[PDB]
Design a protein around this ligand. Structure first.
Ligand code: AMP
Ligand code: SAL
Length: 545
């Protein structure tokens, strides 16, 4: 695989020139856009670009985005025609952010998919003849006034020929038929994922999903669905409640006919006392689990390890709605040691120092410092120039001349389970809308609880008590969160009812003691030991609905 090795060494050594070339490739055709004309960028000139083009947040350039979303010519901001939009997890004052998009995003994405396939096969053997049980989902598109579809990045891929006509090798070979993957009903599709996977269990040499929250759900759903799956296996008939015609036709063929011996074989595996190692006992030829376990997904590692008998957890890719950033070049590492190596062909990257270790104002990709934290700044192929990503990364090293980054967190996010990234700003709002029912009927922090599936939000409050009021304080707190939450909470089942746990009096003063025992009360708490002081000063619990 000499082509790959060469390709990678080239990418990682020539970082500076590739970036400078990329920048020219983006700027040159865009010099007559309204946006670039405004900032006097009449030619490729790197210092003029850095001097005169502003660093922006989503909010700074929103009037431009709204124009294209509403139907105005793409050439306001990009001479590469905007053919759609990406719906970000991140929000802007309630609404999801809508990033401009075209097929360059998928060119980059498929480049990354091919690259990471080569990285994986270099290190992991025994996968080239098997298939993957990948829990992949399509979310249905939202329509814009322009007539262009807004989708999630990964659905932008599934709904395209980049997916339909993908390469014909092991890495693109799944136990599930494409129809299952394309099913907009994810409850139906996940059931079918499991069912097709069980049918073809011996062939499974890997499993996973984009994020670890989803792999966890696949296993929890399996636990709650296995008797039904096995009946379908026994009979050779998919269950009637699956409405999707594509799933109906496609899964029926995988089933093929009554398999009462395979059903018994699976029933007997599932009936063991413990669920420990279940993934590997049902799919014994699995070599790894392919899923993101970095950032807030790290909270799922022990559970993954429990179900998977310490199969390697390979966390390959760091990407976003603005752009795909890069990959993990050391896939067999532990999750807490995962760094992502940005690829210089993805977009032109700058970085804003988030600490004292770098006193510069903004720096190029090749100038970032070891141990230093930065916020990435992206210039891409769809009309984004020098936009803040609102993530925080830490430089852990350099692979040749390619900086490697540990993902620290998304700026301002206090609560995450699954897809939702609830910002502090969202939590103030809702806890202002709870203060009303407490101001009429009759401090605070939060934790993300994933001890049960589905994970759920926990808010501590500092007030017997009625359960009209406090139950309705759970409700308003939920209903004032974002559409990502609500899709996760009401449609997908990735999130259960928000919990309100009332603190004792003085707990919200002896909490000012907590980090004193280390002012500003945290609106989230991760510290296991400080979860202790909270969990023992609860006088009552209440939930949403
Ligand atoms: N590999 C990863 N590890 C941790 N967080 C990630 C990873 N990939 C993406 N993210 C987070 O998910 C976000 C996805 O962006 P968007 O598609 O706009 O919702 C990023 O901005 C990061 O905050
Ligand atoms: O497509 C992916 O596999 C992916 C994974 C992590 C982040 C963004 C992504 O597009």
């Amino acid at each position: 695989n000499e082509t790959f090795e060469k390709q990678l060494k080239d990418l990682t050594s020539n970082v500076k020139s590739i970036q400078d070339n990329l920048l020219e490739e983006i700027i040159t055709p865009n010099t007559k856009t309204e946006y670039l004309q405004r900032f006097l960028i009449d030619r490729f000139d790197k210092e003029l670009f850095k001097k005169n083009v502003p660093i922006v947040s989503y909010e700074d350039i929103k009037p431009y985005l709204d124009r294209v979303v509403n139907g105005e010519s793409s050439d306001v901001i990009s001479a590469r025609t905007i053919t759609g939009f990406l719906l970000s997890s991140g929000t802007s004052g309630g609404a999801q952010k809508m990033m401009p998009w075209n097929n360059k995003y998928l060119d980059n994405l498929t480049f990354i998919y091919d690259l990471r396939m080569q990285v994986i096969t270099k290190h992991v053997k025994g996968v080239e003849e098997g298939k993957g049980m990948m829990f992949l989902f399509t979310k249905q598109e939202s329509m814009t006034p322009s007539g262009l579809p807004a989708r999630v990045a990964t659905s932008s891929y599934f709904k395209s020929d980049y997916f339909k006509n993908r390469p014909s090798n092991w890495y693109y070979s799944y136990t599930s038929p494409d129809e299952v993957i394309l099913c907009p009903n994810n409850t139906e599709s996940l059931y079918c994922h499991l069912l097709c996977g069980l049918v073809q269990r011996d062939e499974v040499v890997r499993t996973g999903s984009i994020f670890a929250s989803v792999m966890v759900r696949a296993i929890e759903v399996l636990k709650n669905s296995w008797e039904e799956l096995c009946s379908n296996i026994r009979s050779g008939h998919l269950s009637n409640w699956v409405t999707d015609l594509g799933c109906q036709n496609s899964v029926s063929l995988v089933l093929g006919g009554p398999r009462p011996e395979l059903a018994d074989t699976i029933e007997e595996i599932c009936n063991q006392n413990s669920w420990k190692g279940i993934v590997k006992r049902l799919w014994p030829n699995t070599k790894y689990i392919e899923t993101v376990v970095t950032g807030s997904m790290g909270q799922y590692v022990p559970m993954l390890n429990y179900y998977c008998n310490d199969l390697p957890l390979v966390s390959t890719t760091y990407g976003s709605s603005e752009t795909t950033f890069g990959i993990n070049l050391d896939p067999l590492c532990k999750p807490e040691d995962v760094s992502y190596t940005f690829m210089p062909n993805m977009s032109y990257f700058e970085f804003i120092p988030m600490d004292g270790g770098d006193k510069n104002d903004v720096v190029d990709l090749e100038d970032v410092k070891l141990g230093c934290t930065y916020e990435p700044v992206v210039t891409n192929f769809a009309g984004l120039y020098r936009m803040r990503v609102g993530d925080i990364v830490l430089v852990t090293g350099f692979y040749n001349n390619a900086p490697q980054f540990k993902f620290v967190r998304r700026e301002n996010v206090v609560l995450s389970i699954d897809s939702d990234k609830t910002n502090e700003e969202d939590l103030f709002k809702a806890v202002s809308q709870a203060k009303l029912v407490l101001e009429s009927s009759g401090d605070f922090t939060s934790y993300a609880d994933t001890s049960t599936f589905p994970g759920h939000y926990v808010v501590y409050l500092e007030v017997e008590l009625d359960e009209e009021a406090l139950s309705t304080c759970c409700l308003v707190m939920e209903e004032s969160l974002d559409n990502v939450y609500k899709r996760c909470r009401f449609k997908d089942g990735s999130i259960g009812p928000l919990e309100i746990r009332v603190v004792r009096q003085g707990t919200f003063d002896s909490l000012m003691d907590f980090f004193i025992s280390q002012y500003k009360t945290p609106r989230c708490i991760k510290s296991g030991k400080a979860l202790q002081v909270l969990e023992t000063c609860v006088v009552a619990k209440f939930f949403s609905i």
